[PDB]
A paper describes a structure:
The Keima family comprises large Stokes shift fluorescent proteins that are useful for dual-color fluorescence cross-correlation spectroscopy and multicolor imaging. The tKeima is a tetrameric large Stokes shift fluorescent protein and serves as the ancestor fluorescent protein for both dKeima and mKeima. Keima was developed using a nonfluorescent protein from the stony coral Montipora sp. through semi-random mutagenesis. Analytical equilibrium ultracentrifugation analysis showed that the absolute molecular mass of Keima was approximately 106 kDa, which is four times larger than the primary structure of the protein, indicating that Keima forms a homotetrameric complex, “tKeima”, and tKeima has a chromophore consisting of a Gln-Tyr-Gly tripeptide.
Purified tKeima spontaneously crystallized, and its crystal structure was determined at 3.0 Å resolution. The tKeima crystal belongs to the orthorhombic space group P22121; the cell dimensions were a = 69.88 Å, b = 83.50 Å, and c = 109.78 Å, occupying two tKeima molecules in an asymmetric unit. The tKeima monomer had a β-barrel fold with 11 β-strands. The chromophore of tKeima was located almost at the center of the β-barrel and contained a tripeptide Gln63-Tyr64-Gly65 that showed p-hydroxybenzylidineimidazolinone through posttranslational modification. In tKeima-B, the electron density map of the chromophore showed a cis-conformation, whereas no electron density map was observed at the position corresponding to the trans-conformation. These results indicate that the tKeima chromophore mainly shows the cis-conformation between the tyrosine and imidazoline rings; however, the tyrosine ring group of the chromophore has a relatively flexible conformation compared to the surrounding amino acids rather than a rigid conformation inside the β-barrel. The hydroxyl group of the tyrosine ring of the tKeima chromophore interacts with the OG atom of Ser143 at a distance of 2.98 Å (average distance from two tKeima molecules of an asymmetric unit). Two tKeima molecules were occupied in the asymmetric unit, and the 222 symmetry of the crystal packing represented tetramer formation. At the A–B* interface of tKeima, the buried surface area was approximately 1260 Å2, accounting for approximately 12% of the total monomer surface area. The A–B * interface is stabilized by 14 hydrogen bond (molecules A–B*: Glu97-Arg150, Pro142-Tyr191, Thr144-Arg146, Arg146-Met160, Arg150-Glu97, Asp158-Arg146, Tyr159-Arg146, His169-Arg150, Tyr189-Tyr159, and Tyr191-Pro142) and seven salt bridge (Glu97-Arg150, Arg150-Glu97, and Asp158-Arg146) interactions. Consequently, Thr93, Thr124, Tyr189, and Tyr191 correspond to the key residues that disrupt the interface of tKeima to generate mKeima.
Author numbering:
A (entry chain A), B (entry chain B), C (entry chain A), D (entry chain B): -2 to 62, 66 to 222
Amino acid sequence: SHMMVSVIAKQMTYKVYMSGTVNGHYFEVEGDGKGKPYEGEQTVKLTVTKGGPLPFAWDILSPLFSIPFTKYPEDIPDYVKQSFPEGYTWERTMNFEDGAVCTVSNDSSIQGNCFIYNVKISGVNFPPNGPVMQKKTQGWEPSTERLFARDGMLIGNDYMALKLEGGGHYLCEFKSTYKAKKPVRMPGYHYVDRKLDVTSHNRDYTSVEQCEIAIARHSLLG
Amino acid sequence: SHMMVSVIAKQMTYKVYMSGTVNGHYFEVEGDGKGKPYEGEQTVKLTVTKGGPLPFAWDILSPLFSIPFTKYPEDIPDYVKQSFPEGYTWERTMNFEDGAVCTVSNDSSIQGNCFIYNVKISGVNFPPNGPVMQKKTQGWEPSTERLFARDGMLIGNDYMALKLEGGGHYLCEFKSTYKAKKPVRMPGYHYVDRKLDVTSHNRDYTSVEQCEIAIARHSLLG
Amino acid sequence: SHMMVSVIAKQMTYKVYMSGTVNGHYFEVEGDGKGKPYEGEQTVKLTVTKGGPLPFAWDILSPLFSIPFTKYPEDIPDYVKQSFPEGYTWERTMNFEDGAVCTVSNDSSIQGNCFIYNVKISGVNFPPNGPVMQKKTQGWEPSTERLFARDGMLIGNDYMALKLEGGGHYLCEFKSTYKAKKPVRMPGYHYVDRKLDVTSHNRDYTSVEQCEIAIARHSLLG
Amino acid sequence: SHMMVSVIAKQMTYKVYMSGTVNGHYFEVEGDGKGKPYEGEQTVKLTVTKGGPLPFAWDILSPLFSIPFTKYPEDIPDYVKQSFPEGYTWERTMNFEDGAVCTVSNDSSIQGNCFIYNVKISGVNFPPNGPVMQKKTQGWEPSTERLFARDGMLIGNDYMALKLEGGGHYLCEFKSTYKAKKPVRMPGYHYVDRKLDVTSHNRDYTSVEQCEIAIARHSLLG
């Protein structure tokens, strides 16, 4: 009784296009990714095409490179997958504890076996001797995103933690808004457990590979 | 597993004394609890001693009434349980989406097989037609606190939500600091799942019963 | 055509009562003050009656010790003064940049020549080696409060700056809500320039004297 | 007074190029300005080059179109004016009360008696029935930025407000970082008063004229 949608194959690839500006530095990143949407497992190779090498931590960009690769159980409506073939948009604001702010905008369509993601990031007020600019980050902690529906949109908040060179953590608030381009069956209050890891990286992070697992769940208690 | 500690029984009680001002209204509340600390289970009966009946939704008080009762797996250092016999303190900020703010301090100490909790709460800028002042809230969704160690303190953040009448959600944002009165072993980044329900109540919530499950865990994906 | 109100003499005294808790430390402060309401000049002697000596900076409490001592020009309605003889309430939230939060609640009545102020403060999550707890503060900078009316209330935001031992500043956001206990003539968008200085202080800040000047104005341009 | 500087005339011009995405809508805007830098006076005519007409209130763009044109008294070190001939950069966060966020970066350089400004803006989570998306805003109230020196950067915060149709105010909160490309003399805690008006506009705001006064000052009370 767990139902797949005919536009999303059990194995799909995607292409990501990303322009951005962080502390006034402009950069373009391109990426090819592949995974199993209904199993919530994905991987993507990223090439920095313009503005490399990047003067900030890679870890601030990693969470902007693929939402349809979430495992939804049979009793929870998959808002994102239901939106295809037309697609979805999302906007995101990331708030770090040293005062830095990022705004993100993403549009997503499909072209046969392939997802197209366009993504812009604008990041400002990054402490010049902070972990992001001194590249003292060491990958994300596994997160749980709270999600609910409001005005036919899907809101998501996530308290995240960048691991720091020399132990300790650098905190960040995620607030996500997902807008389907087509009326879909809205889900209730639910959670997405996520783990993102950077798997391979050359020395100047101009060529990076990362893998994500994304599982949607109910309350684990009751 | 659960690394049991000789000072805290498998079956314990607690006495909670709470005083507080919300929207200028002063109130005092006393309570008697009981639970299985190494299993993360507990009920508690409250009585509003002074300022009953209360002009705000019981639900804004519900999460200030018992942290020892948290099932920690043996591979996670149990910060609060090591803090005893001496005791611990915690401070909290409860920031609601409609501009309400609450500040909470607590002082915990043990007496045989009885826990002692003193807790003061200050709450302001609660909209007079909002859900809390109009008493239209219907209890807390299950949540997942993110705790980590910093300067010998345990820092938790959680993105909460009050269920509302006629569907919908009233978003709250919790930020807690836990401070043991005695050097203890620090835990790594880890999570606590919680479900908290008002089981019984009189007609003006001057007598209330609540029950809490609370289980520590690692990432469900790694 | 600048109009005084018969309940507020050109010279008035006041009495302040303040209970509070900061980083879990309880304290009571009492104060006698005197000034010229229509000239916006005041002074008050503060005695710490309980919980002294205080383990935190004095400068976090100073801005909670007298609003009717503001100079309003003839063309701007004085919301606060118009509320007497019955009085006003106000709630305040102070947000420091090291993450600390304070909530404040104040009720104000009049008794002949004398204003009575009751004030509670709850302050939490103050970094233990931050300027407030290490007492590295050196008085407030002069502030301008933006003020406007909403729902027959007066909202006030102020970006403030504590001066630091060794130069540099420790920032704080003020958000104030004033509620008259009686319908008054609402004012428009306007500014209150304020300067608070601590004038005298014994060595343990158990006996402190401070003076404030508070001037309400229009836009200085146009 | 005004400590004049040989690189910046008493009468100067500027060319502003702006690109930006607000609510996923991409737009480009070019402009020609002129003003009396040591008097703090300037007009500028804008033309929307790409993405005209704009689906949001002009007023959210109005404050991203010229910091050299600020009357500094001789007793205040004029951070931006010392930064030239090289140039300066600034980053800004514009946080609105209804959850909207904008991020802005700018790069400034001089060319004879012409200033060059490049400015990108990212804006997200703008409510579709809110005042900006419904174009019900009617220009900015006069404001007062609070600037101070930190790690060789100038940090300004200001509490702003957009005038609304049918009375009322739509609150915004500005946080700017100013960074000169060349060691300059740092100013003390000081204030900037500003008034900014849309003087003229076509019917779809694809041609707009704005005028700005901007005067630095010490505390008006000390």
